[PDB]
Each structure stands twice: as C-alpha cells, then as structure tokens.
Amino acid sequence: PTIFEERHLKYISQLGKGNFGSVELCRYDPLGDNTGALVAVKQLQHSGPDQQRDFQREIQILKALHSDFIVKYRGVSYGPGRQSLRLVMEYLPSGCLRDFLQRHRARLDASRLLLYSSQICKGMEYLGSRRCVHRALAARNILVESEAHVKIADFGLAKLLPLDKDYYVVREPGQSPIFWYAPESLSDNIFSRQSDVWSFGVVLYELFTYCDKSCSPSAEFLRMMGSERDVPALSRLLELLEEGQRLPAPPACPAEVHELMKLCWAPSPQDRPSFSALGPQLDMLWSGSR
Ligand SMILES: C[C@@H]1CCCC[C@@H]1n1c(-c2ccc(/C=C(/C#N)C(=O)N(C)C)o2)nc2cnc3[nH]ccc3c21
Ligand SMILES: NC(=O)Nc1ccccc1
C-alpha cells in the first residue's frame, strides 16, 4: 500500500520549489483512465549525497508521525535508475496558510487565528515528544486542510535529536530565511526544540498580521534597521536582536498572544517556554474566544 509504482504517477503541476527539491501535484492512476487519487510528490534536483541522505531521513521521520496536525505520509516511489526516490503525501488543495490568510483575511477572526495557533502548537508538541526539530516552521509551509484545520508540512530540514543531546549543530547554511531563526541558530548554527519555539513565535506574528506584506518580518526589519542602508541584513539583525528589539505587536493581536510571542523570543533558549507550556495557554485563549 505504501509503494506507488512510478509509471502510474502522472505529473500535473508544481506546488513548491526548494533549493534541492520540488513538490509536485500528481495523480496516482493505476487504472490509466485519469480517475486515480491526487497526491503531492516530493523529488530531488541538483542533489548530491548530502541532499539524498537528508531526503531519506525526511521520509523516515514523516512516515512515523501520526498526528491530525502533521501532513500525512502516503508512501514512496522509485523510478528506474540511480536517484529514483519519491515521497508521496496527501494533497491539500486549499494550499498553504500564508496564501490562505492573505486571500481570506477579511473573514477570518481572532478566534479562528487562535484555533490555528493551538493546532500548530499541538503538532509541535507531537514533534517534540519524538525529539524532532522541524526548523523550517513558517506560514508558507503550514497547510490548510479545511477552514478550521491546519497541518504542519515541509519536513525537508527536520532532524531527530540524539537520545542524549538536546540540540544539534550544522555547517553554515548557504540560504536561510533569517527572520524566522533563533539568534543561536543564526550566530552559532545551533538548532533545538527551543529554536523551534522562537520560530513559532514568528508564526504567531504571521498569523496575527494575516501575512500582510506591508508588515512582514522583512518589511519590519527594513523599517527598524535604521537610516544606515548598505549594511548586511544578517549582521544588522543579530545586533537588533542582541539589543532586545523585536517585531512589534500587531494592532489586532490580543495582548495575551503578544506576551506569548515575547516569551518565545527570550534571548536564552532555556528561558523560552516549551510547546507543552504554550499549548494550555493558547487552548485557554482559543476556548475563551468561542
Ligand atoms: C506548503 C507545502 C510545503 C512547502 C512547499 C509547498 C507545499 N504545498 C503547497 C503549496 C503551494 C504553494 C505554497 C506556499 C507558498 C507560500 N507562501 C509558495 O510556495 N509560494 C507562494 C510560492 O504551498 N500546496 C500543497 C498541497 N498539498 C501538499 N501536500 C504536501 C505538501 C503540499 C503542498
Ligand atoms: N523575533 C523577532 O522579533 N525577530 C525580528 C526582529 C526584527 C526584525 C525582524 C525579525
């Protein structure tokens, strides 16, 4: 059931492009009559050994996860030849949360944003119990299953912590979404479940601004970086964060949610709340808003 025959996967279109991979909308059509199920299928391009190995990892992690708040693994496929591997996932046609929020802002109220917040937190709690660091977490990689149900996706950078270590360190990445990363990740290449909490804070910011491009993290940075313009962004961001500067409270954001953001952005990773501590608070806020 989890082995899709490659010759029966029919390409329709591209859903996402990464540095080394893409996610493609396909039909699995073993009857050949175009009646099969639609699936989302990841494969690599421009991939060396490291990228192949990371993709094997991604598959094993996602296959093991069973949460209502994590995109469903379906199976794998292999073509003929070297570098044949494909990851088959459920397809969610409503697309990503980032696009969904911008399209439907005028009808998605604070209660609904609280619901999405709580669901994403529950998915991160699930990951944490499996010692998985997601790293990529952002509104652009969270999927909308229905208007009242979201799921975490893009496990391309996900990694399991060793049983006896609560962080990992990588070599300097070439291309990072710098405005989502914890300072220890930006400066020392350290990632953990605590750096995931920082990113979740930025997700809460994305939710409560409806991903408006006028107040995106990059826009706020360009406003707050100061009058000196030709300064490298990463350098300057690290200085602003060290000085204690943070993204502003969105006008429509409940004060209690802004306070949770601030705690997610504590300087010291050990001072940030766990997802297990955040969950109850978001659950109480959501349930009080129904
Ligand atoms: C979000 C996930 C994970 C990242 C790659 C795209 C992917 N993805 C998407 C999808 C298409 C576009 C976007 C989001 C973007 C934003 N912002 C974007 O890429 N832009 C604007 C260029 O996300 N739709 C998917 C339906 N089913 C899927 N199943 C597994 C995965 C999956 C689907
Ligand atoms: N976490 C946080 O506040 N990050 C940030 C701060 C200033 C500009 C852009 C991003």
> What's this structure's resolution in Å?
1.6
The answer to whether residues 87 and 107 belong to one domain is: no
Query: Can you tell me whether residue 192 is helix, strand or coil?
Result: strand
7 and 42 both lie in a single domain: yes
Residues 119 and 242 in one domain: yes
**Boundary residue ending a domain (66, 91, 116):** 91
Query: Dihedral, CA atoms, 11, 4, 60, 63, nearest 10 degrees?
Result: 100
Q: Which domain holds residue 68?
A: 1-91
CA of 216 to the centre of ligand 1 (A): 19
Ligand 1: distance of its center to the CA of 96 in Å? 5
Which two three-digit tokens encode residue 227?
């009058």
Same domain, 111 and 241: yes
Kindly state the helix (H) or strand (E) to which residue 208 belongs, with its residue range.
helix 193-208
Number of domains in the chain: 2
Query: Among 91, 117, 151, where does a domain finish?
Result: 91
Do residue 180 and residue 62 come from a single domain? no
Distance CA 266, CA 244 (A): 9
What is the distance in A from the centroid of ligand 1 to the CA of 92? 9
Q: Indicate the residue among 45, 61, 91 that finishes a domain.
A: 91
Q: Which atom belonging to ligand 1 lies closest to the Cα atom of 141?
A: 1
Q: How was this structure determined?
A: X-ray
Lookup result for tokens 């409503």: 94
The reply to whether 86 and 105 lie within a common domain is no
Burial of residue 117, with CB atoms counted within 10 A of its CB: 0-12 exposed, 13-18 middle, 19 or more buried = buried
Same domain, 118 and 64: no
- What is the per-residue DSSP string for 23-72? EEEEEE-TTSSS-SEEEEEEEESS--HHHHHHHHHHHHHHHH---TTBPP
Which CATH number covers residue 35?
Answer: 3.30.200.20
50 and 167 in a single domain? The answer is: no
Q: How remote is the CA of residue 209 from the centroid of ligand 2, in Å?
A: 14
Best probe residue, ligand 2, of 246, 253, 260 (max atoms within 8 Å of C-beta): 246
CATH number at residue 172: 1.10.510.10
Q: Are residues 69 and 144 in the same domain?
A: no
Same domain? For 166 and 61 the reply is no
Q: How far is CA 5 from the centre of its chain?
A: 29
Does 164 share its domain with 177? Answer: yes
Burial class (CB in 10 A: 0-12, 13-18, 19+), 227: exposed
